[PDB]
């Protein structure tokens, strides 16, 4: 005769996994870590998520892989080792309330289980813990090294054990009351008794598990990335188009440039070519340009739409070039030519094929010598923020349009002003970019590894450390804010962007408002 | 024990030159669970899921009779259990049955081929360079062989297919018979297996029924209660006929066994030989009233010339088709009706019809103007005039992408045909009009919605009678979606249409069937 | 000898799950053989931090183990190496040899980082060979032979500079050489039928004299073999461009019956100018379609400028004159102002016709007959636009000059009498040989020797690069020719910075 209790605590039953006892006969060395790293839970580099009443049951809230990039001490230490082996421990804290109903499941998913779409029925067939959003204290699970190899390489990230969290039952509030309410979650970890490193190497600085940082410069000392001018403004505007297809100033956070984006800010909306002048009788002397790369290399039609640094807007542009004449009384001068960029055919512009056309009006036939030039913009006429002609009328390789966003998110814009010709309006013609120069470099100089889908940034006052807003910076290189206003909203331009954490894609920012 | 030896009892001990391999004990300190298989599964030999093969006097030395890879899919208990684990490891045991008639002669070789050896020819010169055994086709007792887990990992993933050891069987000398009368015997081999002592699985996983094992299964429906896949009608007959063209090039009703649709095959049997288009009407002094249709897809979306010859469900035959259309009129007293046009399908030697590009013209006889309003239509057939079973004119004289013709077959093999009849006009004929397909429409839905994983080249089916539980014949279903029987007669031969098809085994393309009938 | 490292197990860890453990001939354990790419020179002008050699563990380090590797599936175990330096008592300087593990990220190292591995430091005045272990640090139980995986490397750097005197005529280098053999714990895994197409298989050339070959840019024999340094040093030809591993570059064809020709579906009509004009809609010379992709024109299309004659067979439904061969006149020259676009698939040519000679429209194949006003310059592939090309031949080290295979054309020249030369980089037998053998590439270049077969006296040595051009070390100011009845033979893989000897 026996008594079965209704209330039992909760636990995960395990079979022990061997670490360095399997690895040691074919490792070079087996290296120990400081014994007090085994004593403290420390927040994970990806250690923030949220829960809303807009999430639906089945959604995945976080997803973590075993290994050294879960602890900031272990990630600092991996710069001087070639491999790793052993077990870990994770801790979870939820900041909910008394009005909040809901459950989540945290499952342990092994390597080589096909990463498709899990359902709510299936998540409880793994080892798991059942948690609800009203808990005051933290929950912990083990994370074991179930594997087919003898050890792992710190610089190639292969298959390991994962930690998946799913929303089990919907999240509800009793009185309507709180539907703008978000639950915060945080993740923390330490290593368990049986974790080692493998082979001592020189400490390399540009390893993986090195954390991203931004350059410490205020946005008003910087340089616009689509037109050769400083940065003057910083704002967000729902009235404008949401998914622009700009082609300069676009870079991945892992460091790969895309579009015609150059490294230097002295290539921006400028070009270089071989020159050839003729004097068709009607208008004037006409210059046909055979395009090259600005470092003097040849141009080959490839996977961009033009050479690096080409203007990505429409309208009539003014250039200044050097000219060497064959008259009497002059040998060198800065000449002006007038050029049309937009979809304004009858001129047959095809910078994708390596030929552009321009002209200056002249009652003479000034014999200008053929050679090599560098053209720089002077003024713009009828500027539309739309792509120019790249082929004659044909489509070219492009970079995808900016996006996607979540419901409620909008795009952050850096603004500058262009020199223009205008007759009736004396307003300042504005142009935006997503990331300024000083940011497209510092990427592609550093080559970071993205470790998640977005980066959470805080923007502060350099003095008094006040918080101005929070934002998501996605891997593709654009920033989002949570903002549901209708008109514009501009921000002070002398702050500094911080780095907080890697976050998931479904992360819910706090809303900004005028 | 048996009457009359006249032959070899056992290909028993030949030594195989190989070392003992370690199984689930190298993997155990790297899992975080203790797992285990039912001790009674280790206690009897059961037929393998790819477990049948033939040897005929038509085969030549160097042909591969079977080629098995080590893993869960060699046993039916183990292929069921692998749906709820990640990982496997260990050795197996196999049994070979080859007990031909005492009047036969021949040899085969079975080799142990390691991981990472190229897949390709395997000439008869290099198969004996492996650890191998040589076998007579007359051996009475079953021959037993080891299949060992030579590997440089600690275990294997169940939902991958990795490098493991293989077991390859090749015909070594031809098969002959010195019996005085009229025919040479075929040998019927079987493969059986069971796990060895240290086979295990690794980590428990949600049981997911769409795994890479899980053999195909057909729907339990009778042929005479299915829907034709080239004409909108029931299925009525089922027969073979060696007098009709052998390798047709039908475009509708084609589907891969793994779920890929071929040609212009739709999913709904309500799209077969219909179309949806944007219409425009005119009245003139000549043809009468011409209707011009620009085609879209039938759900309602646009059409673009692509990897097919026409939209989905377009009729793949020649003739003159009359259709029926809903139309409006700008007359008073009459609102909406059903009107009938006709349309020629063939080349016509001068035409304005390119259904590849989306251009189709119809017409109706009319003395005055029949003012019919424009809009959206869906055309269905009513009758066929001058039926020809040859492809229509897709692009007037071009070469559009087409699904290949049905074939090849082995010597002696003919095509199984599903038959229905059409509505027609005929002056001097009173017989029906027959159209044939390869698989009926329920089988296209089954394969498109199931996404199976094939094993070798064909499936072996048997056809059973429902009223008496009798097996009538056996056929081969090739992975490209056509069925073949073995028949060497001249007259058509028909079959009842109140039976079921049932899957038996995976087979090679050189499998030889018993003939009907 | 003693570095800070633990002993590594070979067959004790592989044997449970291998099928066989196979032994090697005991006399192979008694000889140190030269490793491939194990040798350097140190000069007084070298800068500390520069890399002397870089070698990975496996069967390819030994010539006997690379042969034996073709009848096996795997390998395991450790090796041992010797380093031999040639200095004397009146030198100074140092080197460091490090043991770098399997997954270290490749890049570049400094002298500060090289001492952070397990290493030895060695003085250039050392007398005996310096002996070391090369161990199998690994995450698997054995390695597959028809595969290359990560293994331990051995890396040598110059640590402090060389200090010496020199005479007036030469300049005193210190030389080094690395030799190897297997350690007692080294084995193979499972006996397989021997393979001929293995990854440890050396490049070889066809045994054919240059004068019996076929020219790669004009359909005719090869008549010369020269080196001329007054010509354009970096040409950009588009035919006869092949990679040593067998990839065809440019518009290079496999067969010599395609060089400087084209096939097309022709269309004719009379114009009251020169006469019957032909619109050639180009096709691939084997009957398949043509789509503008990676290269400038279809395969084999000529790649020089001028005005060219072409012969085509016509059919005329005239009763009394049906089939005949008619020579047209195409002008594919430089910037010669008529809308020629091979890259899109259409060209034009016509003939002086007094009347409208009936010529039906059908399939044709053009062959050249003679050239008029020939320049060595890219044709007009697209009207005035740019086209996907192949990079210019190069680059060459200081002193290096391109070797040229020369032949002669069919000229039209009214006020000249000397014949027209034209060059290529390789004949048409070295092109299809690389395309059929599909070799595996090891360093950057191969060292060849041009020898005479009658006596056995070598004419020079050259450097066949991976992209497919030859380079000799030359200093003279005029063309220097060679006899066209020698034989090219392969010596070894060399690095790019390898200094040949003079000609
Ligand atoms: Mg303005
Ligand atoms: Mg009839
Ligand atoms: Mg000449």
């Amino acid at each position: 005769q026996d008594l079965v209790p209704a209330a039992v605590e909760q636990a995960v039953p395990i079979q022990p996994v061997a670490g360095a006892a399997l690895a040691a006969p074919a490792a070079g060395q087996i290296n120990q870590i400081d014994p007090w790293i085994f004593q403290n839970f420390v927040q994970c580099p990806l250690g923030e998520f949220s829960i809303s009443p807009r999430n639906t049951p089945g959604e995945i809230l976080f997803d973590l892989a075993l290994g050294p990039g879960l602890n900031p001490y272990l990630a600092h230490l991996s710069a001087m080792y070639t491999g790793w082996v052993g077990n870990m421990e994770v801790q979870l804290v939820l900041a909910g309330n008394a009005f909040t109903a809901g459950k989540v499941v945290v499952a342990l998913v092994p390597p080589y289980f096909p990463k498709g779409s899990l359902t709510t029925a299936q998540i409880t067939c793994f080892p798991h813990v059942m948690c609800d959003v009203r808990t005051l204290e933290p929950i912990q699970l083990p994370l074991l090294d179930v594997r087919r190899v003898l050890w792992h390489a710190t610089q190639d990230q292969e298959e390991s054990m994962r930690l998946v969290c799913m929303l089990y039952t919907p999240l509800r509030t009793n009185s309507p009351g709180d539907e703008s309410f978000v639950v915060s979650g945080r993740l923390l970890s330490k290593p368990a008794a049986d974790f080692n490193f493998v082979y001592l190497t020189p400490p390399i600085e540009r390893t993986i598990y090195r954390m991203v940082d931004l350059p410490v410069i205020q946005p008003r000392l910087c340089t616009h990335a689509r037109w050769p001018a400083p940065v003057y403004g910083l704002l967000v505007d729902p009235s404008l188009p949401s998914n622009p297809q700009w082609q300069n100033g676009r870079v991945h956070v892992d460091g790969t440039l895309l579009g015609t984006t150059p490294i230097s800010g002295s290539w921006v909306s400028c070009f270089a070519a071989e020159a050839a002048y003729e004097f068709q009788s009607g208008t004037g002397e006409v210059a046909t340009f055979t395009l090259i790369e600005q470092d003097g290399s040849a141009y080959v039609p490839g996977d961009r739409a033009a050479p690096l640094g080409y203007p990505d807007f429409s309208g009539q542009l003014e250039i200044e070039i050097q000219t060497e004449t064959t008259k009497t009384g002059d040998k060198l001068k800065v000449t002006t030519f007038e050029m049309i960029l937009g979809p304004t055919t009858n001129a047959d512009q095809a910078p994708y094929q390596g030929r552009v056309f321009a002209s200056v009006t002249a009652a003479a036939s000034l014999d200008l010598v053929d050679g090599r030039v560098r053209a720089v913009p002077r003024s713009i006429y009828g500027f539309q923020d739309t792509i120019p002609e790249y082929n004659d009328g044909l489509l070219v390789p492009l970079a995808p349009p900016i996006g996607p966003f979540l419901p409620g998110e909008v795009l952050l814009r850096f603004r500058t002003y262009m020199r223009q010709i205008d007759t009736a309006d004396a307003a300042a013609e504005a142009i935006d970019c997503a990331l300024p120069q000083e940011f497209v470099s510092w990427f592609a100089s550093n080559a970071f590894t993205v470790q998640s889908e977005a980066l959470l940034l805080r923007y502060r006052n350099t003095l008094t450390g006040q918080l101005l807003f929070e934002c998501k910076l996605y891997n593709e290189g654009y920033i989002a804010l949570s903002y549901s206003g209708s008109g514009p909203l501009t921000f002070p331009t002398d702050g500094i962007f911080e780095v907080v954490s890697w976050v998931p894609r479904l992360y819910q920012l706090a809303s900004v408002g005028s």
Side-chain angles (χ1 to χ4, degrees), chain A residues 316-335:
Chain A
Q316 199 174 12
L317 191 62
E318 267 180 343
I319 59 176
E320 315 185 283
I321 72 168
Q322 184 75 261
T323 44
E324 198 274 332
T325 194
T326 311
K327 313 310 298 302
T328 72
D330 55 329
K331 210 211 63 174
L332 287 174
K333 72 181 77 65
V334 189
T335 304

Side-chain angles (χ1 to χ4, degrees), chain A residues 420-422 425-429:
Chain A
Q420 59 174 357
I421 315 281
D422 224 341
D425 194 339
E429 184 64 28

Side-chain angles (χ1 to χ4, degrees), chain A residues 383-397:
Chain A
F383 160 71
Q384 327 276 307
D385 193 56
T386 311
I387 50 166
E389 287 295 331
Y390 278 136
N391 257 315
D392 187 8
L394 208 158
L395 65 91
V396 293

Side-chain angles (χ1 to χ4, degrees), chain A residues 190 271 414 434 497:
Chain A
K190 68 193 195 190
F271 58 99
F414 300 85
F497 288 96

Side-chain angles (χ1 to χ4, degrees), chain A residues 208-394:
Chain A
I208 83 164
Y209 305 143
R210 177 191 181 205
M211 194 81 196
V212 172
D213 46 51
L214 303 180
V216 190
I217 310 180
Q218 300 173 355
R220 73 198 219 167
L221 301 198
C222 294
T223 288
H224 200 272
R226 267 177 87 210
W227 172 270
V231 159
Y232 287 137
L234 179 68
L235 74 156
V236 59
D237 208 316
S239 60
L240 289 198
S242 298
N243 301 274
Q245 202 157 337
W246 308 334
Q247 295 292 308
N248 273 309
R250 297 202 42 180
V251 62
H252 205 261
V253 176
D254 80 337
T256 181
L257 307 156
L258 54 86
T260 58
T261 305
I263 291 181
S264 180
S266 54
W267 298 31
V268 167
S269 59
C270 302
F271 58 99
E274 301 283 318
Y277 301 95
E278 187 65 30
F279 178 47
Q280 279 74 3
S281 181
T283 80
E285 68 208 340
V286 176
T288 191
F289 290 131
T290 318
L291 294 164
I292 68 180
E293 304 282 2
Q294 301 223 35
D295 61 326
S297 309
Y299 171 67
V300 172
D303 258 359
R304 300 156 299 182
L308 285 175
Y310 198 78
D312 64 328
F313 48 92
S314 304
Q316 199 174 12
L317 191 62
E318 267 180 343
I319 59 176
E320 315 185 283
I321 72 168
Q322 184 75 261
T323 44
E324 198 274 332
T325 194
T326 311
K327 313 310 298 302
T328 72
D330 55 329
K331 210 211 63 174
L332 287 174
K333 72 181 77 65
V334 189
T335 304
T336 317
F337 285 82
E338 294 84 33
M339 174 163 205
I340 303 107
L341 279 68
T344 62
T345 177
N346 76 73
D348 308 279
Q349 301 279 48
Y352 180 55
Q353 306 283 358
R355 199 175 54 171
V356 305
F357 284 92
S359 190
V360 53
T361 183
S365 166
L366 304 172
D367 41 348
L368 300 173
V369 182
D370 283 27
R372 146 171 303 179
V373 313
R374 169 175 184 249
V376 285
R378 182 190 207 230
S379 75
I380 184 67
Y381 191 58
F383 160 71
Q384 327 276 307
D385 193 56
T386 311
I387 50 166
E389 287 295 331
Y390 278 136
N391 257 315
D392 187 8
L394 208 158

Side-chain angles (χ1 to χ4, degrees), chain A residues 396-459:
Chain A
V396 293
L398 295 171
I402 282 184
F405 301 86
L406 287 187
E409 292 178 24
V410 287
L411 177 78
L412 180 65
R413 305 159 177 268
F414 300 85
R415 190 162 275 178
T416 201
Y417 297 114
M418 296 177 289
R419 283 174 271 102
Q420 59 174 357
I421 315 281
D422 224 341
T423 70
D425 194 339
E429 184 64 28
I431 171 168
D432 296 312
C433 65
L435 274 183
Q437 298 291 133
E438 301 289 327
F439 271 65
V440 306
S441 44
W442 192 280
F443 299 145
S445 178
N446 307 276
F448 292 128
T449 302
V450 290
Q451 196 73 32
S452 197
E453 294 183 275
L455 266 180
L456 195 85
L457 315 173
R458 269 164 213 171
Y459 194 56

